[PDB]
Design a protein around this nucleic acid. Structure first.
Ligand SMILES: [Mg+2]
Lengths: 93, 93
DNA sequence: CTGATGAGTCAGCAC
DNA sequence: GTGCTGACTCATCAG
């Protein structure tokens, strides 16, 4: 067990490992402490959520880039399959 | 004691001059709470607009890769026009 | 001050 | 219990 645990601790340990440093604490101290855990936990979930949110937009911007890369040479490749196909028709005379 | 009680919608939509009339009578402390509640309410909106703007800009990114996946297609098919213009006019030179 | 936005808290849903 | 995310509050910054 030990004494009072810090944030970087309560949130890291397992659920049973908590019932351990939990022995001997009024009915309220029992919940209120598991609460401070959940709260600390949510705080972290929020942090992933913020990141995720960004890294997902990152991906669209990345695809977007590339899926414009192709439709750039596909507009120029087809511009060339018309410039030389036009000289294979004028040669016809 | 004293005070006349408004509603969120009212207080937020209310205008600066209306607000100032609704102030007459209100104890100083009462003014403070009121002005703060208004701000909190205002932030609520800013936050809402903010959430929106995120959605807005996210669809917009897709509804743009939606114009690049459908544009790499109107050009992948204009790429089918080459089979006829490089096989039917290139067996003549 | 007004508007915007990261961080954190909270409820509510999903597994 | 765990993880996630919408809505909200708060601090804090540009304009
Ligand atoms: Mg709250």
């Amino acid at each position: 067990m030990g004494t009072s645990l810090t944030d970087e601790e309560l949130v890291t340990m397992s659920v049973r490992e908590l019932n351990q440093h939990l022995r001997g604490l009024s009915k309220e101290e029992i919940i209120q402490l598991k609460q401070r855990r959940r709260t600390l936990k949510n705080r972290g979930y929020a942090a992933s959520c913020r990141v995720k949110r960004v890294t997902q937009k990152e991906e669209l911007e990345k695809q977007k880039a590339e899926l414009q890369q192709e439709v750039e040479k596909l507009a120029s490749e087809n511009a060339s399959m018309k410039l030389e196909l036009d000289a294979l028709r004028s040669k016809y005379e």
